Every structure is written in C-alpha cells, then in structure tokens.
Amino acid sequence: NTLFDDIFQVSEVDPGRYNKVCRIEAASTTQDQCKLTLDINVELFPVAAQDSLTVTIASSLTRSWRPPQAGDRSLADDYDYVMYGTAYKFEEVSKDLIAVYYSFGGLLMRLEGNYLNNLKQENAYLLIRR
Amino acid sequence: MIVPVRCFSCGKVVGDKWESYLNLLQEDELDEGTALSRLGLKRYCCRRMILTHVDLIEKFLRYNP
Amino acid sequence: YDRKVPSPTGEYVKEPEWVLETDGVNLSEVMTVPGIDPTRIYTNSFIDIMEVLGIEAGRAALYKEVYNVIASDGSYVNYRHMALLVDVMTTQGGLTSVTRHGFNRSNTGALMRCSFEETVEILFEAGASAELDDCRGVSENVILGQMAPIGTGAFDVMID
Amino acid sequence: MNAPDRFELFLLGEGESKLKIDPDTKAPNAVVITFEKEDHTLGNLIRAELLNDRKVLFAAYKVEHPFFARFKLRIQTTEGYDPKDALKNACNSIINKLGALKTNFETEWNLQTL
Amino acid sequence: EEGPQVKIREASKDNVDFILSNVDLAMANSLRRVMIAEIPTLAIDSVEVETNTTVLADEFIAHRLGLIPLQSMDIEQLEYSRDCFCEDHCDKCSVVLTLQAFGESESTTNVYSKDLVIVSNLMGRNIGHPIIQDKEGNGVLICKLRKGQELKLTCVAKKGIAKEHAKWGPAAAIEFEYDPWNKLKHTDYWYEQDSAKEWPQSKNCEYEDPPNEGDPFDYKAQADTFYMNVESVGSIPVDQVVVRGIDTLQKKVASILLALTQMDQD
Amino acid sequence: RGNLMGKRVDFSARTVISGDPNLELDQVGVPKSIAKTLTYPEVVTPYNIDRLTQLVRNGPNEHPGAKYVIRDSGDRIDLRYSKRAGDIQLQYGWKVERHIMDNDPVLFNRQPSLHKMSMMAHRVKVIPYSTFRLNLSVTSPYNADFDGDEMNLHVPQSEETRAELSQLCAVPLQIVSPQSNKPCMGIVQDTLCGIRKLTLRDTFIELDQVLNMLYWVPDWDGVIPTPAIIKPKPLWSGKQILSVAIPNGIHLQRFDEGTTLLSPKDNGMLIIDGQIIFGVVEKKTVGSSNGGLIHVVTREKGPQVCAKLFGNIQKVVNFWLLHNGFSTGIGDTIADGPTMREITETIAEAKKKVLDVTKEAQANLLTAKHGMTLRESFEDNVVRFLNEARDKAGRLAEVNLKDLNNVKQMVMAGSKGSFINIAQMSACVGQQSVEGKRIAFGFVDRTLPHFSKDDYSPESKGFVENSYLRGLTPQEFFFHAMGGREGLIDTAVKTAETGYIQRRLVKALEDIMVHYDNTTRNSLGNVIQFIYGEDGMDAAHIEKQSLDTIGGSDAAFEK
Amino acid sequence: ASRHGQKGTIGITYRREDMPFTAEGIVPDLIINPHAIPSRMTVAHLIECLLSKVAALSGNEGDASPFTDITVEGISKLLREHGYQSRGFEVMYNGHTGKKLMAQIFFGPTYYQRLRHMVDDKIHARARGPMQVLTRQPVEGRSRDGGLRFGEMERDCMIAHGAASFLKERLMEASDAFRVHICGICGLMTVIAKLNHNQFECKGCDNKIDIYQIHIPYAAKLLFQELMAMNITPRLYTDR
Amino acid sequence: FDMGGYFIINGSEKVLIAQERSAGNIVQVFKKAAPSPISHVAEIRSA
Amino acid sequence: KAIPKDQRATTPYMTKYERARILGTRALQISMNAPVFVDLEGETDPLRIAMKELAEKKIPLVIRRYLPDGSFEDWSVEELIVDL
Amino acid sequence: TLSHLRRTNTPIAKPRQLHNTHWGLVCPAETPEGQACGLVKNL
Amino acid sequence: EGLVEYIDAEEEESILIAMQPEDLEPDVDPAKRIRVSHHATTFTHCEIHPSMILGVAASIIPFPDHNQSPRNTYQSAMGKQAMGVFLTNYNVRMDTMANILYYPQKPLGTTRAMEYLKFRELPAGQNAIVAIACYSGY
Amino acid sequence: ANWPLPVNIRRIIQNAQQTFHIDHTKPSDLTIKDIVLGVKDLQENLLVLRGKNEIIQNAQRDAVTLFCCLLRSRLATRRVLQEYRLTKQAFDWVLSNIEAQFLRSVVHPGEMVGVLAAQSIGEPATQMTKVTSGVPRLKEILNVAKNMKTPSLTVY
DNA sequence: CTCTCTCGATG
RNA sequence: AUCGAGAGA
Ligand SMILES: [Mg+2]
C-alpha cells in the first residue's frame, strides 16, 4: 500500500559536476518541519527551480523483474517519474524531527519529517508527478 | 621492396596504382596529395599505403645474379 | 615540531614545542647538559644509543631507524618482520651486522655459513676445528637433498 | 606454431554439434544454447530479435573467449511458451526481414544509373 | 515492400551509397560484418613455383598472388575443395592459371596480373579472370624482372571465405553512420570549449532534422536510419556484394533453423 | 651457490606472458606445445584406467595424450616410437606419463623472486598460441608487464607435492599477504578506470545491456534486479548491476572528506549486504588497500569467493568498458589559453623573485641562515622558489582540466598517472637537478658555452619553463638529459644494491621459524622471540582497528 | 614498439569485423592502451600521431624535427582544415554491436617498428632431457634442450611458503638424484659396493656388514669428493 | 649504402670501438680525502 | 623418553602444514590403489578422496610434533581440529 | 650499423653522468641501459 | 675561407656560442615554446644546428624535445632492434642470421637529420594506423 | 588509536545486527551478568600459549593484553546495550565468532617467518626511489656503519 | 659484493 | 664444455 504522500516545493536544483542527474532541494507545503533532498534524473524528468512536484512513497504496485507486459497490468502509479531504492539510515534530529535516507541506485534521498511508517525495508517506490 | 598489392587497413587494391602515381608525379607535375587524390585514394590509410612506400626493388635489380 | 599532548580536559591537542636538530653527534655529553629533557633526547645513530642507554634502547632505536627507512618511501611493512630482523641483530649481545662480518661469524652450521660470501675458508676452518653440523638447518638439508624441517617437514607422520 | 587453423572458425570439428541446448538450473523455464563456429554477427542479431518478442523475459548472448568461435545464448520465456519456439520465431522473423530487404534493395538498384 | 527500406543515394561500379530505413542496429551491424567477411570469393590459394630467379622471395610472390582480385561472379556454382569429392583439386572446385615471365629487353620487364593465363576448364562459368581496373589494362604489378631473370609458376585458386583469410575479401571499406546529430546520445562528445564548433559536421546531417533546444531528450527513440557506403574490390559487383551479404546472413540463419529442426530426432 | 642452493630442473617451461580478461585469478594460460612437452606420471587406478587408456590411445603429438608408459619391471615405453603404441593393456600399478591437462596444479614464477608471491600455484588452462596467459589482477604480486616479460612454470611429479602446491602455494591463499597485512592483489588498468566510469551517477544502463552484463556473471542467481528507474524508462545504474558481482553479507563502510551519508560529491563508500549504497568505486575501494573490498571479502566469504569475485568484477567492467570506450589524446594535455597565460606569468613572477634575491645577495645584504653559507642559503631559496613555481603552475593546469579529461580520469580512478604528470606535460616540467643540486658549472663559471660566466639565472642552472606539450629548448633538453641520465644511473645502482641487500637479509633470517611453542628460534634453538610478533599472531589475519578508549575527553569517555 | 620507447607485445589479433571503426569504415591496424601514456609522459608519440595524420591526408611529409616552431596548434588547425577533430579524435563504432562508443578515440597513423624478440624464438619447455657430465644436471640453453635454473631466490620462496617436499622434488627427482654408499665407521665415500653380489667392501676400516645407503644430489657428492681431494673429511653419520 | 669503416677478419665484419682515456702530459691538482696525510696532489701523466 | 598424552601444550588445532602433509600423504596412498575408508560417491581424484576422508576423520595417521629441546607430542588426526 | 660504427667504450669520479662538456660531442640520449650505462657512449 | 672552425671542449671553454643565428638581431604565439632572449653580446661562434647534439639513433626520434629523456634513451636502445632493410645487397650476402621487413615504409613523421642517415631510403618499420583505446581489455 | 590487531570486531557486530535482523526499537533480553561475565570469560578462551605454569600463563596474558583492551573497549555494557542493541543469541554468537576468528588468527607452527620477514623487508626496498634516507641509509643500517653519512642529534 | 636468450672466437 | 662480447625485464 502507501506509506507517505505530500506535495513539495523545489527550492534548488544543483548539477554538481553532472549532466544527467541534479540534486534537488525542496520543502513540504503542508508541514513547516518537513523537508526533502533528492537526486533527480533531469534527462528523463526535467526539474526546474520553483516547481510543485507531487511525491509519494509506496511499498508495492523477491521475484525477478519482468518487462512491462503487456499491459494489461496494474501499474498502480500513472505518475511521471518513478524510482525504486532502499532505505539505509534513520537519522533522529529531534524527538519531533525524524529523517530517513533512501538510496535509488546511487541517487540518494534525505527526507526529514516528524509523524513514520517507513521501515528499513527493500520496498521503497518513489513516485513523482507534475 | 615492391609496392604492396592491397592496403593493410581496409583492403583496397593499390598495387595497380604505383606507376600511375609516379607518372602523376613526373609527367603531369602534381604534388603527392593531388596525385593520391586522382587515383581514388580518399581514405588516408591507402593514401598512406602508397605515399609511405619505398620502392627498393629498383635498387635490387641493379645486381646481375 | 608539532606534538599531540593530552589536554587536562581529556582529548589530545596539538601542542607545538621547540626542538633542536643537530649536525653532529656526541650523546654521552649532550644529554648531561642542564636545560634540556634528557629522557626524550634521541640520535639517528643507534650505535651511540646502544653504547649509552643499553642494548634494549639500541634495539628500539634500530627498529625506529629501519621503520623510518621503510616508511620514508611511503611504503608500509608489518611490525613483526622488522622486529624479527632487529631482534636477530640484537640478541647476540651487541649490534650484529647483516654481512660476512656479522651473522656469518655466528656459531651455526658450517655448510649454512659456507653458502654465503666466504665459502671455501669457512669449510677450511671448519675442517681444522672439527666442527659438528647438526643438519637441522635449511641450507644444509638443501645441500643434502633431504626434506628440511620446514613447515611441512617440521614434524613426522606415523600410523596409529 | 601454436596458432590454430583458420577454418576452425566456421568449420565444425570432429563430433562438435551446431547447437547445444541445455536446461538452465538457475531460473525456471530458462535455457542456455551453445552456438558453435559463430561469432557476434549471429548472436547480436538473434539476441536483438528475441527482445522484440514480448513473451520473452530474458535474452542475452556472450562470447566467453575470443580465441574460440562460439557463443552462449540464454533465453527465458513466460510459462506456456517453449523458448525453442521463441528462437524459431526470431529466426524466421530475421529471414523474412532480410528477404524483404533484399527485394527492396534489388528494386532500388534497378532504378539507378552509372 | 513491407519491411526495411533502401534508398540508393549514389551508385557506381566500385561504390554504393545508400540509406537503410526501418531496421534494427544489430541487423545493420551484422550485415556489415557479413559483407566484410563471410562472403564466398575466388582467390589464389596454392602456388607451385618451378623457376624463380627474380629478386623477390618465393612465398613473397606467392603472398602477392594470393591478394590478386579474381573474377568471382559465378562463384556460387563453384565448390569448396574441402567439399568436392576429387583429389586435391579439380575443375568443379578450383581454377588453375599459369604464369610465365622472362626478362627480354634491356629495360626492366614488369610482371602484371594480366600475364596470368587461365589453364583449367571454366566450362561456361564466369570465373578466374583477374580483375583489371587499371587504365593501361595492366592490373596489379606483381613483380619486376631484370635482363635474364625468369619467373615460372602455376596458381591454383580455390573458393574461400574472408573469415579464413583477408585475401578472400570481396569488399574494402564499408562506411557506416547512424544519427548524425547524436539525438540518441550514444556518444559523449569530448571538447575544450564549444562542443559543436570543434567537431566537424557530417554530410548525413543534410538528411535529418536538427534538434530543438526547447525540446527535451527523447528517451524512447531507437536507431532506424542508417547511412552506408559499400565499396567493392572488383571480384564481386557492389550490388551483388550487399545482396550476397544478405543472402549469406539469411542462409546461415536458416542453417540454425534447420539445426533446430534436426534436434527433434530421438 | 650454483649447483646445490639452486640448480636447473626438469619439467619446467618458460615463455612470454600476456594478459587475459577471460581467465580466472588462479589460472594460467599454457601453450599447447608446452602442454604436450611437460608431463606428469599418473599411476593406474580403477578410478582413472579408462581416461588413462584413452590418453595413451592418443599418445604424443595429439593433446591430451601421453609420452611414456612405465611398467612393473621399471621399463619405459616410448609412445612415439613403440610398435605396440596402438595396443596397450594398462595394468594396475603401472605409471602413465600423460600431458599436462586442465586444472592441474603448476608453479608460476617470475624472476627476480623477491618475495613468496613471486611463486604461486595456478590451475592449468591449455590454450592456443605461444604465450603464458595470466589474469590482470595477478600482475601486481609478480611485478610484471607484457612488454616482453617472460615467466617460468614448474610441474610437480607426485601427489603430495601437487597437494603442497594446491593447499599452500595456491593463488587465492596468497591474496591477503602477511607482508603488509593487506591484500597484495586488486583491480587495475582497464578494469579500474572502467569501474570508475561505471559507478558514476550519470551512468545509467538500459535493458538489453543490463541483461548481457547479468548473464556475464557466472555466479548469477538468474534474478533480474528491479531497476532504479521505472518510468518513463526502465534504467539501471552502474552500481546496481555491479552489485551482482559482490557476494551477500559483505558490509563496507568508509568516509572520505565531506562524506555525510548523503554525499553531495558522491565520494566515500557504503555497501550494505552485497549492495553498494553510495560512492564512486575506484582504487580506494576495489584496489589493493588495507580495509578494501578485497580484504573484507577474503576474510569473510573466503579466498575462493574472493578470486571468483575478481573474475566477476573483471568480466562485467571489461564488458561495459568494451562497449563504452575510453581513450587519450594530445587534447588531454592542452589547458585553456588564459590558464597557460597564468602559468607563464607565474613562472615570470617566480623568475622575477629569483632575480630579486640574486640582486640582493650580490649587494651583500643577504643574511645567511644560521648554520649554512650565504651561497647555500641563496641556492636553497632559489630552488624553493622554482619548486613552488612548478607546483603552482601544475596545480593551475590541474584545476583547469575538465571531468571529461581522459588523463584526469585515469588520475581519478587511480589507474595510472599522478598530479606531477599533468604538471610536467601541460604546465611546466620544472627544475632539473643532479646530485641534489641544480646543474653545476661543468665549464668554468658556466654550465654551457652559450651562457656568460657566473650566470646563476634559473634558465642557466637548469630550469625548464616549457612543458612537454610546448617543447624543450636545446639547453633545457641537455640539462633534462643530464638529470634523466643520473636517474638511470642511480636506478641501476639501486636495483643492484637492493639485489644484494635482499640476499643478505634472506641468508641472515634463513633458518628462523616458529616452533610448536610459539617460540621464534633458529637451527641452534636460540630464542629470538619468546612469542612470535610478541603476540603470537600471523600477519595475514591482522587488520587495523581503532582503540576508541585512548581518544576523546574524559567527559565523553564517561558519557 | 613505437618511436618513443613504447614497447609492448601483441595480446591478441582481431579481424576487421571485431575491430572498432570510424564512420569512414577505417579500421585500426593496431590498438594500444591509454594507460601507457600519462605515467611515461610520451607526448611526442601523440604529436607524431597528429602530424602523421595531417601529413597522410595532405600527402606531404610531416616535419618532426626537434627544435622547431612547429606546434600542436598549427597541426590542429591543419587537421581541422581537412575536416577532422583538431585533436585527432574520431567517433568510432564498436565492431561487435555496431553501436557508437561514448568516448571518442585518439585515432591516426603512427610509425611503429617490429623488434627482434619473437615468441617462437623464446618459447621453451623440457620434460627430462640431456644432462651435463660434471654435475649431471640439466644442460644450459634452449637450443640444447636444457632446463631452467631453480635459483636461490626460488628456493627462498618455497621455504617462505613451507612446501618442503616440493623443494626436495626440485632438488632431487627433477634434477640430479644420486644414491651413494657410506661406511658406518669413518663416514666417507670410500665404500666399494659390489652389487649383484652384495659385497660392500671398505679398504681402511675392514667394513662389510656395517654399511649405509643415502640419497643425495650428485652435486653434493661432487662437493664432498672435491673436499676430500682438498684434504678435508666430510664424514656423514646417519645417527644423532 | 654500405658506409665501410670496418675490417673483414675470417669473413667476419669487425669494428674497433673507440677507447676513452685520460689525456697525457696534462697537469691536474686533486684534493685528497680527510683521513689522508697529504691534502693536495698535483700530478701529470707523461707520454 | 617421550611426552605423556596428558599435559600436552601444543595447539589442539591442525596446522596448515599438517593438513597439507596429511592430504598429500593420503592422496599418495590412494594414488597407488589403496583401500578407501570412505564412500567415493563419484569422486575419483585421490586428493579429493583424501579430503573427504579427512572430513570424516577416517585417516589412521598421527602427527609427531617436535619441540626444540628434543621433546615430542603425538596428535592423532582424529583428535586434531580442522578449522581451515 | 651506423650506431655501432660510432661507439665509445670506457674502462674501469662520476664518468657515468652526462657531463656539461659532452655538449655537441656525445649524444646525451644514446647510451645502454644497465651496468654499461654512461660508460658506453655514442658520438 | 675561415667560415667554419673546428672546436674541441678545451677551446670551447673560452668562447661564447650563439644557439641560433637569429641571436644576432636587435604580439607572440602562446603555442610556441618560451625561449629566453639573448642576454649576451660578444659572440665568437654560432651553432650550426642544435639538433646535431644528438647521435644517429636519437636522430630518428620524432619530437625528442617533447619527451622525458629516459624515453629517448629507451628508444635509442630499441631502435637498434627494429627490423627492415640493413643493406640493399642482403640477397648476395651470407650472414649468420638476418631479418628483412616485407614492406618497409619511410615514416610519415621524419627529421631533417634523417636525410643524412638514409632512413627514408632504408626504413625500419611501418606506418600503422594506430588507435589509443580501451577495447576488449586484451 | 588505529592499530593492527587480529579479528575485526566491527564487521562481526555489523554481521550480528544483520544476521538476526535486530531492530533499534526493542528491549534487549540480556543481563548485566551476561554481558560483564560473558566478556570477562571470553578473554579466558583467547589462547595463544597453552602451558600449565606461571611463566607461560604470564606470557599468555601479556600476548593478548592489547586485543583484550580492544575487546573490553568494544564490548562494554553501555556500548553493547545502547549502541549495538544486541540480544542474547546475537551476543553469544558474537562471543563465539570472536573466539573462533582469534583462534584462526594464531600463527601456525612451522611458519618460516624468518625468510618471510627478510622478503617482507627486502622486496619493498626494491621499489624505493635533510638526512640520508632510502636504500643507502638501509645499507648503512644493515652494515652497521661505524661512520654514518648524516649523524644527527634530536634534542627536546 | 653483484634470471634469460644469444652471438664468436678459443682448447 | 672453459673464458670474453651483445642483449632481454
Ligand atoms: Mg617489462
């Protein structure tokens, strides 16, 4: 099912000596104590400054990866840019501030929040739209 | 020795173009580049193959045995 | 020189001190000079260290110097090796050299010492003094073409 | 001196069969087929044509050593679909495309000058 | 037709400049590989030297004879010596041509490829004749004789594959280029300042549309358009080079298919 | 020393070596002719009588076969001249000298044999052509290139000795060396640079190539890893597909400079359970470092798994690199115009400084440093200035280089080359020196007949403003030739004196070993160390660990 | 080797198909590795390549003379005039797959030379061959079908490993393995062993029943005999 | 193209390598070592 | 003289040299068609058979460990621990 | 051949080092690698 | 005509040599090499040409001033091991062992000193279309 | 702090909190006695020498003093319960694993470490390129030079 | 005190 | 085989 859902506002785009991946810095538009850092494949899903991207953390939509056949199959997304990685660190800034670290094939992610059902599990789909 | 029959790199025949090359150098009084161009040697590998070659057999024939 | 010194609060802090480097060596009189700390004074000559501060201090200085030689290139060798070298150079009583004047003058086997530098003369004086070769040395069993007491041959195998 | 005969690149040796089909033990419904006396020319094409079949899960070829002219081809298809049929369909597709290509090139050649 | 498409841009006796449309990369590449190597051709495989008083060595000359381009038109109705049921070679598998040269004049007596004389029985098949694209009609310069130097030898030419030896190579250099604008981004261009100004612009750029900077990267695009130029040596006409290339590839696929058909035997 | 301490032996071969990416670490490429030549006596047993009979049936000239057949009486049957070479009833107990076959234990060696890693046991793989083919990652312990290097191969003749080779002298058993308590083997050359290029965050791999690389791993589970990118296109990262080569249970943690779990520069390294989390893979990781990947895998999974790991990494990385490509041209030695201008002006201000110091010293205002001559002080200052100049210009040239610069890429990967190479090639090769000093006055009061007497200027004493890209002037060329000459001289001297020193060391510590009481002694029983290494540990099983009680405040200690 | 001290042997040979190729269809005669460039700093190799490329195209003779004002920039401009990358780079395609290569390859003519050292003149292998006469050890040389010297350092390595039986095998069965008889009294090779009659004599101590038999290298026997000829008695006892 | 400058002994081409030596009849002064009793030596090799 | 089975101070674990020597000796015995004390189960290589025979402690050999003074401790293969 | 015909041999403070006076008389580069280095020179 | 002189080292001690004849004359190219201007005036001699400091073997090296000197030395050594035509009369000589290149080629990059060494007449190597690339890893 | 010692305890611990999949939010089923007396009894098994007299036992405790310091430093109650959060099974597994690896790390009798040392010193001396350092200094040391080239006196 | 091919003269 | 010479890394 779903584990997290929020809308973030891109505050910075940084091509740190790259040309296909940029480190994006954004913050939540609902919680004033929630922020996000995320490496994005700009070559696929271009992310300019000051954008309102819809971000979702799913646990599903192990077995081998079959090609998207046909489908004629439940994609359970219809987003714009979807990734899959693994959480590796649960940093605790405060009692009211808990941060999680995801790794999407090298494309890292730092999500700082408060209230989470994000366990150290291989299941970590990152779905971004609009 | 003698002019190599074909180009090592690609394989284009060049052994039939040696005397023509020499003539283009002495008869029509052209430079090596144009002479190599007129013989259809566009790729610089064959161009090399003819330009770089030293005909030593002419010196070899100077002996009587 | 910069130096790591334990702070009163606990951690180690870089406390820089003035150190006197020197072209020239005479440890037997410099350390007795009023003004310096005579417990930390050191010289790159392990000879004087061996003659003044004892054979163990000479050992420590020897290892320090060898290790300095190795690490100066930027390389690294484990402690036990250089320690073994220095120990074998220092267990005779003084400083035994790694030449034909040092360890080759030891009271080991005749063939062993004969298989290095001075060959014929060693055999000569071994024949004159009627020496006994234990044949438990490596090179000796190498000469004899027998399974030397080395690793695999460092024991016997029987049946039970 | 120790250099092998050239014809050993395309001539099958004594007892050597063309194709060696072996049941893959790793993944279920998979197969590894050893092609003898063939290089990248065939392997790359077949592998590229096996990725067009949407009922094929896996398809990859490799030449284990450049000294020997041979390559292994691993194929994994969906259940209820024998991989040999996938290889056959791929091959037939290739042959058809090449036939059409030949015909088109001929017709296009007849319309030329000099 | 219905599949891949061809568009002959330029055509001549020696070269064919064309465009392959609606094709996979692997098929184009494999076609190139087959055209380069796996195509049957007739060339001198055996050389029997009787007398040789020339400067050049025996196997030197023999090697030069091996590289001589021969007529391989009806090569498909010639046979491999390894397949023919004869001894060594015959008229159904090999073509024998002699070579007798001798210094006559005081000047240097040149020995060309035209001096090769077919001895074996061609029995109708267009084969064995040494290609002479020379203007004077001489052909490949084989050797040079002095005054009393003699070169007497015989040449047995057999059907062979370029994969076995480059002398059986029917083609020279095959030009090959896809996506002149790097819209597929298969190449990360090296530069010092400006990437476009430093790297020369290909001719084939005149046959495709330049990218728009306002447009993002097309990640779902493959390679369809291929620009090729096949050059022949003379042994086999260009059209027949690419055509027999296709036929050879197709045939060696059909051999695999046949193998699959045969593996059903208990 | 020539007939007893060492002598010529039978069953030995010697050939020019070459690298082979498709051979395992503990494998050796053996030419077919050598395989037919070298032989092994195998006694006839019920387990192998069929195979041996077949080998005898093949005889010599055809591999695999046999050379001789020894009977009970002790008679030797030559299988190339005997009339009964066709019909032989191999009786039990008979010996059959068969050709060297695959997976046979042989001793690979390269002279000079400086340490035990110069002689290692390999598995035979009979291959065509006349070259000893060895794995790339075995180059380092042997200390060998392929620019004409030759190696020797010795063949055991009994079961116990080949057992000695397979159980003691085996290559996987020599990975972690007791010399520097670290692995002496690692990923080098193409595989290194390649693995640096693959694990870049910009490096993404699509379906087909991923399937190919996946198949290339022999230890593959056949399970397709879920791509790091799902939509709008299924893409895998280099790290992701490389993770397949790394065995499970392998945890690797290392922080570099600004490595902060998120690592904006993608530096450092974190690998959780055979899966790399973040960090560019290069020499600090997949190299022959102390706490590297190889050491961890060797100490954890075992030597065999580590060698197979060498295999996997090499195959994958070489495959990707083969279809990606890498090169180097003169363009990688060309810095920008303004950069060259800053370099030239740096050399200029340096020479100006030297000129000022010279004019000062000539005005007798130069106060000498305590303990040295005014002249020595002047020389020291000038030399330091010119060195600072070379370093400055070189650093400018290095900064100017892009990340797409091939030379800089090889420097980054740790594959080949260093900073000074870039410095001398692109910026300024610097000051030439002989016997510690700059080019002295061979002629009276001058270095060359092209200068005036008493010319202490930098260009006169052997400073080269130009780079290898720019071209050296005649004077600079000759001085550089002097320096290089001294280089070659002291090189030969060095290898000679070391050649003797090593022998002395060996002959000194020869009969020393650890007995069955952990007491390091000799042939006399004289105790050298009562406990070997003063702790009784083998240097092979020792890793650098931190003692986190000796550091920190007392407050933190208590806390 | 090139003309800049860039030595190297052939690793493998590839046909024109497997070889990488430019868009013009030009295939390299030779492929070298870039790692043999930055450490050795042979820039003149690269400059030679560029100059030779330009000279090839233009059909002129490239002047690579030492102290001249011919710079890499001029050569670059000349190369750009002929329609190529000024730094000699060329877009190449992988021969196996036909797909483009990401990085472009430094590609061009370079004057290489074939050295005298060839494998078929170096390759050597011996399994029991001709021995010498004095020491009865394998002869020296490849032409005389000789063996290879298991030198002192190799011995040291085998000691370091611990392989004792191997060291014994190299120093006996693989070389000179000789059987000698020793008198149980003095301990010298004075023994006259009349075999097939079991008559083990010893003139000097009258020994016929107390005799011994040991296995030593023939070189050791030679050493002992030479020491005996130099008035020394290497008495060999078989007991502690 | 043969430049000569060599001998032919028993059908074998021989080359005399130029031998480097110190010049005679030249006066040279050299400073002696520290353990040496003499400090400076002026010598000459007469021919 | 000797050393009693009790109060033995040497390492209870089998050294790598002891393992190599025992595997080599046993394989040397099997190579001359000697009786196998374990199930072959397909194995034909005498070294491999010796290894499997070691794994089941079916090797009737005994190690005589020599101390520098001249003393010696006996350790049966069945008793020694193999952790390598 | 040309190189061998113009060679210099030297028997037996620093005769190996490329001296300043070697300018224009002896090739600075052409010299064997090893024990004969510096001693064997070419004109 | 007193235009050229023979100078040994001993007499070379007392003269001032100009490196190039352009050092007798009373906005630049950044590409070219940095050359220190002549700070000397009283010249007595001038160099014929600096490239004459090299020997026969080193004169074959293309751009030796763009190399690290030991590499020039190495090439100076290996140049004597290259195959090619050593003499035109190689077929009428009976040497112990000789090697002759099949198709010799005069280098594309030459030297002005090569002219007098007859290298372009009797070359020792071929111009190979080289490619610097990490391919199969072989 | 960083020093070469046998048995990498860190990798053992991070293997423990991976094999048993222990979460960082669960009370450890350990006991103070379990940890303290467990670690204290673990040191008794770390045997290098196995004599039965006072001398050999003293040498034994002297030979493992450092590694035991490391052991106590890493396996302190606070560190085990708070930082590692090990369970009972995991802790016991850690102890057993440490003991095993330690017994593996012991040098094998018969090890020709003399030659090994001589080579471990001689070989890196081959790849070697203001006092006298490097190969000549090494030669001075090995020859035991009566008169070294750079006699220095470092005075603090 | 310092692993290979090789040549070429000597007994 | 014994002594000199060239060269390989
Ligand atoms: Mg080398």
Ligand SMILES: [Zn+2]
């Ligand atoms: Zn060509």
Ligand SMILES: [Zn+2]
């Ligand atoms: Zn026929």
Ligand SMILES: [Zn+2]
């Ligand atoms: Zn007697």
